Design a protein around this ligand. Sequence first.
Ligand SMILES: CC(C)=CCC/C(C)=C/CC/C(C)=C\CC/C(C)=C/CC/C(C)=C/CC/C(C)=C/CC/C(C)=C/CC/C(C)=C\CC/C(C)=C/CC1=C(C)C(=O)c2ccccc2C1=O
Ligand code: HEM
Ligand SMILES: CCc1nc2ccc(Cl)cn2c1C(=O)NCc1ccc(C2CC3(C2)CN(S(=O)(=O)C(F)(F)F)C3)cc1
Lengths: 185, 143, 74, 139, 534
Amino acid sequence: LNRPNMVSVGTIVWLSSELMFFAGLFAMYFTARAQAGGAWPPEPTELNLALAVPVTLVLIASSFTCQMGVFAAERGDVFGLRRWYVITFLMGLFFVLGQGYEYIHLVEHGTTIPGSAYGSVFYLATGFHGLHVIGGLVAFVLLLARTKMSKFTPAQATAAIVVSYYWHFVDIVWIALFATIYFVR
Amino acid sequence: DLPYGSALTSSGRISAVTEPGELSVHYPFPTMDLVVLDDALKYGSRAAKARFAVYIGPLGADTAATAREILANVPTPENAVLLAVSPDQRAIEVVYGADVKGRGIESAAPLGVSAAAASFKEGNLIDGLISAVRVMSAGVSPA
Amino acid sequence: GVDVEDVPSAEWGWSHMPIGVMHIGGLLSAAFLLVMMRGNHVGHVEDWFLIGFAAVIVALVGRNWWLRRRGWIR
Amino acid sequence: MHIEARLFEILTAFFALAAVVYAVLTAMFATGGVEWAGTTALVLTTGLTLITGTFFRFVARRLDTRPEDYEDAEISDGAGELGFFAPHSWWPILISLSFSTAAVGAALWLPWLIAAGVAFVITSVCGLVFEYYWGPEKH
Amino acid sequence: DFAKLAAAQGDAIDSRYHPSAAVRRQLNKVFPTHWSFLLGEIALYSFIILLLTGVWLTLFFDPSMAHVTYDGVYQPLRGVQMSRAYETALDISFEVRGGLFVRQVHHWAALMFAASIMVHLARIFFTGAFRRPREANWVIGSLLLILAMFEGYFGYSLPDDLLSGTGIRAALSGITMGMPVIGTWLHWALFGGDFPGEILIPRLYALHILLIPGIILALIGAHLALVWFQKHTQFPGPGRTETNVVGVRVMPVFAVKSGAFFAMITGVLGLMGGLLTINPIWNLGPYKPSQVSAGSQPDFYMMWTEGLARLWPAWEFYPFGHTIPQGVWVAVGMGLVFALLIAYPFIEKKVTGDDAHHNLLQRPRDVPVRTAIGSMAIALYLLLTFACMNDIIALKFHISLNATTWIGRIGMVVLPAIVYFVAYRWAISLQRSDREVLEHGVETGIIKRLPHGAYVELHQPLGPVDEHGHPIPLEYAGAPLPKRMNKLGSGGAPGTGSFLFPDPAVEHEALTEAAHASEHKSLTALKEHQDRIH
Ligand SMILES: CC(C)=CCC/C(C)=C/CC/C(C)=C\CC/C(C)=C/CC/C(C)=C/CC/C(C)=C/CC/C(C)=C/CC/C(C)=C\CC/C(C)=C/CC1=C(C)C(=O)c2ccccc2C1=O
Ligand code: HEM
Ligand SMILES: CCc1nc2ccc(Cl)cn2c1C(=O)NCc1ccc(C2CC3(C2)CN(S(=O)(=O)C(F)(F)F)C3)cc1
């Protein structure tokens, strides 16, 4: 093993680009917060941290299970990789459903995109993160089927590794979003 | 010897160069009649199912034997019809291989030489070669 | 009739269409475009579009016929 | 790959200096304080270059020298099988057409067209990712 | 019990009717297993659905043009003058349990019928299945397409609503009226008078539940009898010749496959009839001749007709005190299409001079001229269909409606030619791809560098290889060639256990060896048969 895996370097480079996309989203969020006039989040929204903490913990532990799946895949254990990646998929889907519940709770009160600037930036940033999470889940399903189609070669493990890279990037961006939206406010 | 800027690479292939603005190919004929001759050779060889070849160069003594010598370089000499013209010695020789035997070429070759020389007498080398290839390809028939 | 150097599997199916049919069809289509100019419409941008498409079709037909005439297409 | 990680480290350093200097220079002397727009972009540009360079440095520390990175080496050092490269595929054009369908749906805001475009995108990405792994049809 | 009973029933059946020879001949009939040979099956199965639901619809529909006041449950139409047919259609939708579901399943099955007939016709045309001795079967199929089109037309016209009434007025009345000498006579024979007659809905009902379905059933029976007794075609392949049929016997593989496809097609139709709204006639309202809506369109299989009416540029003739309207063109247009559809095998026989008996299909790539012709036809059909819909296209995808009409007018001449050129070149290019794979072998995708620095892609010869190494050029035999090494058994055996937990390695070894040996045995059997018949 005396070469770099270029699928991995390509995935790192693209993940950096996606981080820059989220930079654009953060630039949207931070402006219009300096225009809050001492109310941020301005009324009537009420940030329910009580439901937001569990989904963050679920996403972080799902990254832990994804890393466990990578450890399984690197030694040629296709079945352990499938187990840990099904765990990661279920837990990421749990995160998506928790974010949906948070969305419906906020909307029922009156925090919407056409309502306020806070709802605007909040829904934009978190919805694009949720889109990235749905993309990650699609990647997980596709990779699991691909491992089912063929003998588990090193290229299979490379693909699983780069999918885990994508999941780690998503969980980190979510940690930044959480620390900026629910703690710094 | 290798010319200026020519190198024998590690694969045995030769890597040549050209001075900026110069030509890798400098045949003393226009591109249009060269295209005409290329089309004539290609389509006549497809129509006669036999490769055709045109040679311009010195023949020395016994132009027949020289044309025998040079048809060995054709990729498929047995299935080949080579028209060798020495314009300074004013010699024409059609040479045809074993596979092209009794395929209508027996009459075509003298008629090919007649067409070549008839067009030559005006002073058009490529026109005569084109005419000879055309008439020979008409004469020869696919196996 | 066509050979297998231009259409590899010419022995397996109908693989040649006479050039005259496509030439005549192109000219007829250009004529149809020209005919569609006379009508019950008041606009004239569509007239320019019809003239342009008829012009390009006639140019293609004439180019093909000319090149086949000189043997540039065999 | 010491030089690659070195390039990205240099870029990361310059971008960190630019971001911090911009934040300090607009916290004071700017009308609204921290600009909150250029600062975020510069900070995450530092993040981009940092991610790439740090990953490349982890790669290079555990990597023995390749022929490419070693001066005065022979071509025969590079002999052997390179990896796998797709000879051909018609899936990229279908992926692009599906993304275009979804983009047209989102431009004109036709939700059905967006849904159809996303379905086509998923199908064509499935085709691309599965292309060289479909085994023989088992009958 | 059910063994001695089966033996006794077989003995009784054979003593009364002695069908053993004929029944065994039917059980041993071999059918090729290509997926496209299932397309026709779809057109059959949806038809069966159209019968079943159709019969159900006859138990509640009243085909009358007599005026009534609604007086029903659907509030937005109470007190509205309508026809008895529209009233009973609303009653099917709202008053009968499962009536709306049966209506929607029936209309979805009509759409599937039309679409599957079109796809099956495409398969037959492009694969050359119409050639001798299968020309009369093409003629029957074309008549079936025409009959199905007019059957669906007369069907969605049965509930006398505003949209279908507009369709009846525009097409069945205006075009019929405008024809020369016998046009108005045809109109008055058909409608029994002027257009808003009293014997139109009953007449269409009798044409639609009995007459056209009876003709269609007779033609389908003749069609399938011909396919059964002129055995099915097949693609060229390993053991495939002009004199054999290679595939599976009727019992049990083919029967199970056909029954399961029937079940799954019925399931698709049921899901669509449940989860997708088709023809919600309470929103359209009853048909009044004085009112019309913007989106006046027929079902998709008829749209080209209306499209041909939209784009033709208002050319009329007035010879000696008479009028030949624009709609005449439309009728002629339809006829031309229909004629050119029915006579195509004879036209191609007259053009190519090929009157040989054929049983091996052609790949569409190997017949570039016919493939280009069919592409031209499909492109023209699609352009007419979308021209019919240019109003909705211009409302959604913002375009001038005049711009869409002019795009259609220029396109219905330019686009067929472009499509012909592109399709012809594309078919020849596919042939060249096959030739490259035969000359050099499957490109694996692996690239390696030689000690002198030459990059070479590893090639996989598909046959004999010369002394040092290079493929011995094979000969094209009219069959597909592998072009991905994954399709050959390269890297194709993961762990044999469940999706999450594996099985013991001994069972994996046994199953892998069994698969390997069975595949080798099948390949060997095919090769020995092919050598024996050669
Ligand atoms: C193959 C062929 C046409 C042979 C005929 C031979 C010939 C030259 C006849 C003369 C042609 C003439 C004179 C006129 C042409 C007009 C004509 C033939 C009318 C009769 C109707 C007819 C037989 C049409 C051809 C059959 C046809 C187009 C079948 C469809 C092609 C196939 C195989 C499609 C399979 C792909 C599939 C199942 C789904 C892909 C999804 C898409 C985008 C399908 C395209 C599509 C279609 C096809 C619609 O019909 C449609 C209707 C309403 C709204 C939208 C759509 C739509 O998007
Ligand atoms: C190829 C065969 C058939 C086709 C393509 C066809 C097509 C259609 C269509 C599209 C409708 C409109 C449904 C709606 O809008 O509600 C319809 C209505 C109807 N069909 Fe059929 N049909 C076929 C066969 C039959 C048969 C065999 C029967 C009777 C046994 C039947 C009975 C009816 C009745 C009574 C209606 C009017 C009731 C209603 O519209 O709800 N159809 N037909
Ligand atoms: C212009 C066609 C049309 N526009 C509209 C506008 C709105 C709507 Cl909602 C429907 N549409 C349609 C339509 O539904 N199109 C399908 C269609 C059905 C029947 C017919 C007629 C054509 C024949 C039956 C009539 N003839 S015939 O031979 O001369 C004679 F006299 F009947 F013998 C051919 C034509 C098209």
